[PDB]
Amino acid sequence: RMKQIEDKLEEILXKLXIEXELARIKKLLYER
Amino acid sequence: RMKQIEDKLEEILXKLXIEXELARIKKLLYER
Amino acid sequence: RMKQIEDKLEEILXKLXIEXELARIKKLLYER
Amino acid sequence: RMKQIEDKLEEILXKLXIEXELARIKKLLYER
């Protein structure tokens, strides 16, 4: 169970590569 | 404490559906 | 310690109200 | 497992400094 919690944290820390998206959104804004 | 931690992790992985706003922001930028 | 972990999850789930910011960023884009 | 979980939570609360991109996105939008 403690392992499963660790796994879910690793998936969130996966999910937060959001910060890919934000870099791309920033680039689009510089151009437009 | 373990059950409450598991509950919070699932709610965070809820909160990250952020991916609503970001999808809309990306669409708006494609169109501009 | 398990309590401290729960506390940090609650702070992150604080931090993610990011999704305030994203709603505001979306609104600015609709206007510009 | 407890130490590794604590390590991941601090790294996530690192990853959320996202608040780089979002600050820049907000500034760009104010100027447009």
Which of A3, A10, A13, A32 is most worth mutating to test chain B (most B CB atoms within 10 A of its CB)? A32
One-letter amino acid for residue D3 of the chain:
K
Structure tokens at D23: 């600050």
Residues found in chain C: 32
Q: Which residues contact B12 (CB under 8 A, 6 or more apart)?
A: A12, C9, C12, C13, C16
**Other C-beta atoms within 10 Å of B2: how many?**
13
Determination approach: X-ray
Sequence-ordered list of residues with C-beta below 8 angstroms from that of C15, at least 6 positions apart, any chain: D13, D16
Given a contact cutoff of 8 angstroms between Cβ atoms, the answer to whether D22 and C25 are in contact is yes
Query: How far does B19 lie from chain C, in Å, by closest CA?
Result: 9
Neighbour-count burial for A1-32, b at 16+ CB within 10 Å, e otherwise: eeeebbebbeebeebbebeebbeebbebbeee
Specify the residue for token string 């151009």.
A31
Q: Is A8 on the interface with B (CB under 8 A)?
A: yes
| Type of residue numbered C32 | R
Residue in the block written with tokens 């601090």: D10
Resolution of this deposited model, Å: 1.7
Interface touch D16/C11, C-beta < 8 Å: no
Two tokens, residue A20? 């890919």
Preferred mutation among B2, B4, B10, B17 to probe C, highest tally of C CBs within 10 A: B4
* Residue A29 token pair: 């804004």
Helices (H), chain A: 2-15, 18-31
Q: Which two tokens stand for residue D24?
A: 């820049």
